[PDB]
Amino acid sequence: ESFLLSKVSFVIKKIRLEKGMTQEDLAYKSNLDRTYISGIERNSRNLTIKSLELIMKGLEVSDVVFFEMLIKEILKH
Amino acid sequence: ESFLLSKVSFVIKKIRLEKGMTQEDLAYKSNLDRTYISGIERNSRNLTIKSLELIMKGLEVSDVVFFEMLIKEILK
Amino acid sequence: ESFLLSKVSFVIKKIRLEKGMTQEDLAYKSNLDRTYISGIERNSRNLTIKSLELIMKGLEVSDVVFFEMLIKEILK
Amino acid sequence: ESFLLSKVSFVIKKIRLEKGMTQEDLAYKSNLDRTYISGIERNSRNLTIKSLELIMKGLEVSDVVFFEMLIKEILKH
DNA sequence: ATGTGACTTATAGTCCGTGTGATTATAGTCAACAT
DNA sequence: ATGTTGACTATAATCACACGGACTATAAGTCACAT
Numbered sequence: 001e002s003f004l005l006s007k008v009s010f011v012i013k014k015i016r017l018e019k020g021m022t023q024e025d026l027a028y029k030s031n032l033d034r035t036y037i038s039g040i041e042r043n044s045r046n047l048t049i050k051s052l053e054l055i056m057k058g059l060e061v062s063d064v065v066f067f068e069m070l071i072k073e074i075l076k077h
Numbered sequence: 078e079s080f081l082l083s084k085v086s087f088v089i090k091k092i093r094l095e096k097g098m099t100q101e102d103l104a105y106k107s108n109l110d111r112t113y114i115s116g117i118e119r120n121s122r123n124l125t126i127k128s129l130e131l132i133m134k135g136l137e138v139s140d141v142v143f144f145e146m147l148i149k150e151i152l153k
Numbered sequence: 154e155s156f157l158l159s160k161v162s163f164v165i166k167k168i169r170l171e172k173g174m175t176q177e178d179l180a181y182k183s184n185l186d187r188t189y190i191s192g193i194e195r196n197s198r199n200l201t202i203k204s205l206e207l208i209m210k211g212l213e214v215s216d217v218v219f220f221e222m223l224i225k226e227i228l229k
Numbered sequence: 230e231s232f233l234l235s236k237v238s239f240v241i242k243k244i245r246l247e248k249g250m251t252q253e254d255l256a257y258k259s260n261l262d263r264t265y266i267s268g269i270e271r272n273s274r275n276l277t278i279k280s281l282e283l284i285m286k287g288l289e290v291s292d293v294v295f296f297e298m299l300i301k302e303i304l305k306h
Numbered sequence: 307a308t309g310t311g312a313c314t315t316a317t318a319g320t321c322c323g324t325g326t327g328a329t330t331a332t333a334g335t336c337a338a339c340a341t
Numbered sequence: 342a343t344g345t346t347g348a349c350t351a352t353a354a355t356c357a358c359a360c361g362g363a364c365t366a367t368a369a370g371t372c373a374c375a376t
Binding site: 155156157158161199200201202203205206216217220221223224227228 | 234278
């Protein structure tokens with residue numbers, strides 16, 4: 001599938017667990033379905049920037065902070 | 078509209094220019110539609126990550142450079 | 154404790170008595186433990202439907218007759 | 230498995246739909262797990278009088294009218 | 307060249323439900339001794 | 342006869358998650374016509 005997606009997928013989960021959230025909490029605060037949060041983490045779904053933005057707000061994290069961890073995950077071995 | 082969306086778009090336009098590309102050529106290079114691109118640059122589109130990825134390929138810019146730039150752009 | 158659970162227990166005891174049964178006999182007839190039965194009637198047990206069902210069979214009473222009674226008891 | 234159980238589980242669903250509720254509303258209002266409401270209807274499951282009571286409160290229905298519909302369902306052919 | 311508009315078609319995102327391993331609270335069942 | 346106190350062990354009930362189908366909103370991709 002897509003390189004960037006699974007990275008975006010990975011980072012959303014990583015943060016979520018770092019903050020001791022559950023998918024239920026997250027989909028809560030992101031005002032998306034818990035099915036969608038699952039869908040994203042599970043099968044790296046192809047979300048929209050707007051949806052990503054909602055998730056960032058849900059993770060109680062900033063644009064910047066997210067993208068900084070995104071860059072880190074991309075760079076890894 | 079969205080704050081992020083506008084700066085993604087701004088960034089896309091910034092890079093296209095710093096490189097000296099036309100929209101026509103960014104569309105060709107990324108195998109997407111020119112009106113599609115025009116839309117994004119006037120910020121009338123809400124890309125998916127996949128699309129963004131194709132535009133990065135077209136701009137010939139790695140994900141990292143794009144995001145390094147987007148961050149800087151984000152901080153006024 | 155619970156209102157319903159109390160009325161259920163009361164009903165179980167009521168029917169046992171109008172039939173002149175002992176607890177010992179109610180437990181023999183439904184193959185459950187006598188201390189188990191005791192416990193319900195002193196309202197110290199929160200039984201499951203399955204258990205309730207075994208007790209009805211031990212009381213020789215249909216589900217319907219039981220609930221008809223349970224409703225009436227519920228209404229003071 | 231159990232005669233009465235599938236009757237109880239049938240009636241919980243009947244009411245739930247009659248009141249235009251979804252499972253996960255009822256799971257909230259009944260102050261029980263999401264998956265328990267499913268599990269009760271889905272298969273049958275052997276609930277407790279206390280849990281049944283919670284569900285009745287959740288269906289926004291009285292002990293009495295629940296049991297009245299229970300009786301009616303038992304009596305069917 | 308770029309910017310519209312408007313018009314399909316793919317798919318992102320929603321909504322309601324099923325099914326499941328793992329853990330925790332508690333009912334199910336049965337001792338010993340009471341009265 | 343019934344009551345009560347511990348117990349052990351089955352299972353009710355919880356919690357975090359995956360997975361599917363069907364439906365709705367909207368992004369993806371392509372026309373025509375501006376400039």
